[PDB]
Swiss-Prot record:
<dbReference type="InterPro" id="IPR019981">
    <property type="entry name" value="Ribosomal_uS11_bac-type"/>
</dbReference>
<keyword id="KW-0488">Methylation</keyword>
<dbReference type="GO" id="GO:0006412">
    <property type="term" value="P:translation"/>
</dbReference>
<comment type="function">
    <text>Located on the platform of the 30S subunit, it bridges several disparate RNA helices of the 16S rRNA. Forms part of the Shine-Dalgarno cleft in the 70S ribosome.</text>
</comment>
<dbReference type="InterPro" id="IPR001971">
    <property type="entry name" value="Ribosomal_uS11"/>
</dbReference>
<dbReference type="GO" id="GO:0070181">
    <property type="term" value="F:small ribosomal subunit rRNA binding"/>
</dbReference>
<keyword id="KW-0689">Ribosomal protein</keyword>
<comment type="subunit">
    <text>Part of the 30S ribosomal subunit. Interacts with proteins uS7 and bS18. Cross-links to IF-3. In stalled ribosomes contacts ribosome rescue factor SmrB.</text>
</comment>
<keyword id="KW-0694">RNA-binding</keyword>
<keyword id="KW-0699">rRNA-binding</keyword>
<dbReference type="Pfam" id="PF00411">
    <property type="entry name" value="Ribosomal_S11"/>
</dbReference>
<protein>
    <recommendedName>
        <fullName>Small ribosomal subunit protein uS11</fullName>
    </recommendedName>
</protein>
<dbReference type="GO" id="GO:0022627">
    <property type="term" value="C:cytosolic small ribosomal subunit"/>
</dbReference>
<dbReference type="InterPro" id="IPR018102">
    <property type="entry name" value="Ribosomal_uS11_CS"/>
</dbReference>
<comment type="similarity">
    <text>Belongs to the universal ribosomal protein uS11 family.</text>
</comment>
<dbReference type="InterPro" id="IPR036967">
    <property type="entry name" value="Ribosomal_uS11_sf"/>
</dbReference>
<dbReference type="GO" id="GO:0005737">
    <property type="term" value="C:cytoplasm"/>
</dbReference>
Length: 117
RNA sequence: CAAGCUUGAGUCUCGUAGAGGGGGGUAGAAUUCCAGGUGUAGCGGUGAAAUGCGUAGAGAUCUGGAGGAAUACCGGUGGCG
């Protein structure tokens, strides 16, 4: 548990959940928190409020590392794309960059079939 | 039947556009898998769940590798056959 002061907030904003992982510049994870692990199951898990409290709890899992400036890498179409960024900025964090890294295949693999719901 | 004619039908000259066809090569993004680092209790999924994966360390993230398939943007009641 040494001091970093330079982190990256990897937000995995899926349709069903939101996973926030704070790593250093190299990519080694220091702490993480999810919407499902913050007391939300089912319908409450895929909400911007659950993502916000997950970003709040993940920012507390790295208080021993003393991060002052951290990057934001958003990935996924689900809710909590901007809610986690707001919850990270409100937690006393200097957001230096925000980046969308959602994977886009250049017409690669075949996706599953449509749901006849 | 015989001889014609050039307007139908073709040949030649010079260019133009095109996912037209057959063969070979190669590029990047992504999925999956394998090995390793960080890291910890969830992940995944749904109307809600459960089956399923996960403390034998999953999911997340980072690095390297393997393999196959299809070619985002261009891209368009656009083009060729």
């Amino acid at each position: 548990r040494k001091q970093v002061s330079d982190g990256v907030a990897h937000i995995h904003a899926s349709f069903n959940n939101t996973i926030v992982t704070i790593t250093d510049r190299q990519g080694n994870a220091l702490g993480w928190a999810t919407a499902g692990g913050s007391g939300f199951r089912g319908s409450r898990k895929s909400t911007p409020f659950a993502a916000q409290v997950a970003a709040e709890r993940c920012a507390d899992a790295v208080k021993e590392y003393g991060i002052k400036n951290l990057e934001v890498m958003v990935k996924g179409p689900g809710p909590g794309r901007e809610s986690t960024i707001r919850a990270l900025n409100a937690a006393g964090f200097r957001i230096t960059n925000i980046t969308d890294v959602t994977p886009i295949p250049h017409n690669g693999c075949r996706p599953p079939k449509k749901r006849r719901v």
